Assembly symmetry: C2
Homo-oligomer: 80 residues x 2
Amino acid sequence: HMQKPIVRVFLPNKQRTVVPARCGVTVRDSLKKALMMRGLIPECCAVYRIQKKPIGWDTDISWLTGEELHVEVLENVPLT
Amino acid sequence: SHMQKPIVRVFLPNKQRTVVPARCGVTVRDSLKKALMMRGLIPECCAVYRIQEKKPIGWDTDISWLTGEELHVEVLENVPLTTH
């Protein structure tokens, strides 16, 4: 809304959160706490918008005000 | 087939494709670096998925775990970074 710009975020395991769509704040930093609370970290997850479209973790979240993001855990395959 | 020559099939943006060697110890990023560059892409501007149906994998994944699989590379949504 005009007063309170937010982004709705759907999380693993049927969970969800709302974060403020603050200018200059990455998606990564916007969601760090919500992820931590659930034992997740951005580096082990992918984020996407709707309208199944992947977005970078370093995106400025204010560009996505009004949108829904989805966070999925990355496939469990060993790193090099 | 793969016994002698383990490979991963990779689908790329704009209906393109490539095959890469699935060699132990090599990242997805590095396996695909050259194919992406030929198309003016960079892994950091893209996402990669395995077919299982599209499940996101990390760029630093060891590609040898994916022998026989099909990967898909998509360009990230065009949304400014905070540094822009």
